[PDB]
Subunit: 305 residues, 5 copies
Amino acid sequence: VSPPPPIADEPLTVNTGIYLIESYETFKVNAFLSLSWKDRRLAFDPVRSGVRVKTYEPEAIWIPEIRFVNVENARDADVVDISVSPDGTVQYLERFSARVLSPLDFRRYPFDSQTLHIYLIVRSVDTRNIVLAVDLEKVGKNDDVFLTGWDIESFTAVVKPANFALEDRLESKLDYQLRISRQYFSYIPNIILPMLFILFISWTAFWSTSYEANVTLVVSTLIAHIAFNILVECNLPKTPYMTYTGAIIFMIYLFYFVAVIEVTVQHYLKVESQPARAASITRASRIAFPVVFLLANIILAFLFF
Amino acid sequence: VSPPPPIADEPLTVNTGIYLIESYSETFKVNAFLSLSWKDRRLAFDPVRSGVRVKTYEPEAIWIPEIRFVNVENARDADVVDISVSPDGTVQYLERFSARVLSPLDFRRYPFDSQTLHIYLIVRSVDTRNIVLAVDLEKVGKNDDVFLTGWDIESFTAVVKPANFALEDRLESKLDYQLRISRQYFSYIPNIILPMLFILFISWTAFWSTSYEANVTLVVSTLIAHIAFNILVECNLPKTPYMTYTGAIIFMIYLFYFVAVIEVTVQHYLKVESQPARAASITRASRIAFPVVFLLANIILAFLFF
Amino acid sequence: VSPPPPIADEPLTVNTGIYLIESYSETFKVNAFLSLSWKDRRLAFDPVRSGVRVKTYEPEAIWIPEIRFVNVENARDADVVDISVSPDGTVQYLERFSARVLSPLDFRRYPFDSQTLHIYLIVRSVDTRNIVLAVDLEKVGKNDDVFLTGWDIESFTAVVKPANFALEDRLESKLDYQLRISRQYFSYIPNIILPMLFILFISWTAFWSTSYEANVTLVVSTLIAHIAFNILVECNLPKTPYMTYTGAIIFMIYLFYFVAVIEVTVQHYLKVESQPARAASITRASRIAFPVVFLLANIILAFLFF
Amino acid sequence: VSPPPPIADEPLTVNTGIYLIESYETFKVNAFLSLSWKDRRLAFDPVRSGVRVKTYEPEAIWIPEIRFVNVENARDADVVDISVSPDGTVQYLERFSARVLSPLDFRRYPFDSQTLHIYLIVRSVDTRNIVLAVDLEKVGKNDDVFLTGWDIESFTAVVKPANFALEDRLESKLDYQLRISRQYFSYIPNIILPMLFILFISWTAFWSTSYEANVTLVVSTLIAHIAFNILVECNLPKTPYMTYTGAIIFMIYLFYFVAVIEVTVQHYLKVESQPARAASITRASRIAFPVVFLLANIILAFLFF
Amino acid sequence: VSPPPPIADEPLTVNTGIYLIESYETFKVNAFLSLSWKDRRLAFDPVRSGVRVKTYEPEAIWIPEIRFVNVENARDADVVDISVSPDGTVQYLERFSARVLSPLDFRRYPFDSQTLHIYLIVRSVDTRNIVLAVDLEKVGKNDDVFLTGWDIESFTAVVKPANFALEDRLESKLDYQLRISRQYFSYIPNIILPMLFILFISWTAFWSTSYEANVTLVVSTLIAHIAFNILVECNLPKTPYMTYTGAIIFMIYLFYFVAVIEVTVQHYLKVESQPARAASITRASRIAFPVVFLLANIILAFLFF
């Protein structure tokens, strides 16, 4: 079957709509794709037919070749209904389960908001040009729409389509945006708190002179920090980009090094009989370490938010 | 084929039923029988002239309602078992389907939790007539070989009254099938809480010691052992982005290792400062402070979560 | 196509058989031949006029009984090999199917266990006539290239008498195919129990020492080594929620690291308190207490599990 | 259907083209495969025919059997359009999602550029010979082409096909090259820096005489290095061949051994009462260890770059 | 369609051949399955027919049911070409991607050679008997055939088929062997070397008298060996059967135990005021431990090679 012919030179407007049935660090969505276009070749008089509307099969009529852009593979398509109104207006409906192929911006994790994108595309034919449109009454989401650890803020579409030329033929692109924000509250007692306790347990080598107990304090807590980093391996990003957590983790690895330097220096001074000077440093460190940490954290929080 | 026409204005009632064959796979898989029954007078026959009790049809041959599932992975691996039409026109459909339950678990009470797995059946009404779902209670159940290791399958029931609502200007009829399960917690004690408690107790022996070298080594080295044990039971400890009864216990333990370091640090600091009467007072208190605050805080939490 | 009609009121006997080609991938997948044989007189012929001894049909061409499997992960990868009709109308069906065995293992005796893997064949009887399953013992077996690494494939047999029962008002016939595999335990000793025992023994050398610094470092540091080794053999140590032979030994070991800490703590506490005669008495007893209670408790458990 | 016949003895030239839609330590690509060949059995006079171009179905006409060489399994094929121009010029277009089966060269990780390969092949038939060609206007990539942690430099094709015989029949291969380079900057604060801090924390046993504190310094940091190696397990290559990073990691394991030897020698001299000699070594080591490291690193950097 | 009839009582010989296009601790392969048999019912006089050969469709003619034995699931089949020669000889060609289902024998890892299997089977029919044959011109492998960390030595077939009875009907099995050997070099600097360094770092407790430093030396390195074993978890066998590497690992766990015993005894003797003896065996241990290791290793190497 060929596409419907133009009354005049005008292109075929396909009224699209996505409504999230079920939505569920990667994302998959189960939804309704609704398509509507006018094919007069199908028009009928209800009187001769004895039907308000005629229900067709996908094979029977011309259906626009609507493809998705960023998704895993050929969509799990299931046609729900095909309805033609006496005028030849085609009301298509399909149910599709699809994997969201968008990278997340981990730069502000775990205090971030993401915008998941769903791209609808149609390539225009030799016969006539096809353009995409949005039926706002056919764009939404159910309420059973859950995404554990996230707050589903919106499901909206950029109404104005992206029309552009590709391999000498025109293409019409549409942008569906699932905007989500994170449920950060558990991060404190699970990730930052114990990581901070381990670093604090190290800092008690600023009220000690025993190099044996001090080596054992700083070094043994370096092992505990690394093991805890492996414990929360999942909840920490794979990112090749600068991240808020990444720098905070890095800063900690540096603070374990500075603490070793102080400890080492202090012991060297004591061996060297400048104990008044060493005890001065170990005394300063009791306020230096927690103050530079709290400043550097505030510096970073500003640098990332 | 079009849907059957109404006698009067009434909608088409589809008598549904799910019967669990098997269950498997902290995620869940179902293998079951989906039974559907509706009246199509167009298919009706006079039993006497026809001779035969009922006639067997093919899915393509007749009109079958478009019944879809809601919380399942992808398009069901459908297999039609039998299609039977009663003299009066009522159709007896049966299919075998294997599906994955897309229902989240509530880990807030892990490992003393009961879970309600959901299977939603939906039907969209057509232009011709309206379709509504019903439940044949004789056709809703589960086999007895229905096992779910580490869980107790309590019930498989359906919320008989459907959720009828309008979506995209057309009516929809949703049905709720509930697989209620509770966990088999008894192994948790000797595998998860007991050794975690032993590690914390082994730390507390720094309350009958004055050696800061042995005390640093006691508290710090056990912190490493607790973290490594947490990695040993990584699977058995929930991922939840929400607070949990086990969630808090673990946190409380990380806090108790910190307080224990503070005491140990204070004790040795007083010792150096030559106030041993005071130091030995604290270390003596700690021998009863630490186990008492733990047992209280645990009881506080158990109440806060149950 | 409808099922063949009864000579009298008798049901249709379907002669089944499964023959193992290959087994693979603590879960198992099985690829084999499903042979089915039944009498359909509607297709019977006279050899003389036909000439041919037997004719070949296509699955679509004739009525084939709807044989389904019960405990299989995904709708069987179906491949029809051959369909043959003998002069008297006796159909000889053959298909090749690859299937995932869905049977849980009884880990109550790992790694000295014997499992019994199940394959269930089911047929639902139709309105026309009743169907019952049978077993052709000449068509039930396994190849010799049948390997299951770390297991000894003892048998492949079928419970000849089928389990007839009613379901959703219609009659059903179930068959039991049993793959009996026992373990290849010998490598367990040098890989799992031996080093775990060495770590526990390395701890016990704190019974010939008085240095609380060296004793804390001996018991505590080996606790970390035991946990790390438990993570090293994470795959071999079962996920089971139930009582297990290995799972108790692991528990008992976590307890022995606690008792040892207690002795070590008591020993130094008496030494500090100046009852050295008494402390050296305990540390001396422990040199025979610890290895004796271990060897007794192990024998107690081995009896409790075997 | 058989292939089109030759005017004379010449082979059938198939004008190929791949244009990347999607790209997503393994790689998968979603793109447009464009094919063009002349079948005059389909050719028509535009004037009498009326229509500019006739749209056919894949089954209807003869389409060359174009296969990919290094890809996972039978391609996710989806025919977009088939157009026959008046001259019989078949303009084919399909959308294919495919997994790239090319091994990476980790020798220079994380400072490496990679050339991903897509091989198009056609086997010539008994009737006539088939050869591949490249329409340069139909080879490219979109701009939404992302590969997180990589910089997509080019998508080009080796225009000259590699013609050769296989099993007595002639074959025509084409080389599509997706040249990418890595986004290395996060490697420093995540992989090399803490690994260096752990090794430095060890070296502080060159300003200490306490064998207890020295064993605890060298040995305990060896554990921390191993645990950190497990923390970055993902970001460290599996190569059976030698590598720049793999060599460094090895050199570090050796430096922890040398440091143990010094520490052991120092205390052995101390017990043996040659403290002049012991303090000489520990003094040398303060400059030996950091100098040999910085030299050996420069030696390796040159040996790999 | 039925099989071709016998001239006399002879069986149908099917000339098979597999040619590896692409190979990729588990293995998959992309190849060409070539089949050739004589079906006279298809024979033609070349002169009157004009054409040298005629191309058929799989559905059109009788093709032998050739199945594979050790592969995951039903082969991703794709028919390339079907050609009939004037005498009725059928030249079939298909492209199949398939996962090798053969167990690896790790009893010599990482100095092992492995023989990957591909079995071809055909079940004989009631009409006539079918037997498999090998066209040696149609058995091979491409040269771009790579298997990272392995050396592809051969791809050969056991020409003589295994003919046997199954469920009362005859069957014909063929053996295709992809013989590969390992690229072990990197094993030394990645697995055995650091494992040896950790064990050597332990042995420095034979030049020490400090029981605190000796407990910390032997015990702390035991943790480092276990953590390193977890670091190389991937590169080490899962085998339920004895391994050369498996016993070495075991022997090492035993050497850490012996080292604890000697340490413990030595301290015990010194406490007991018999320093003459403790010093004596500790001196023995300096040569006992490295000698028994080097002997036991040689014993094992012989026991496994």
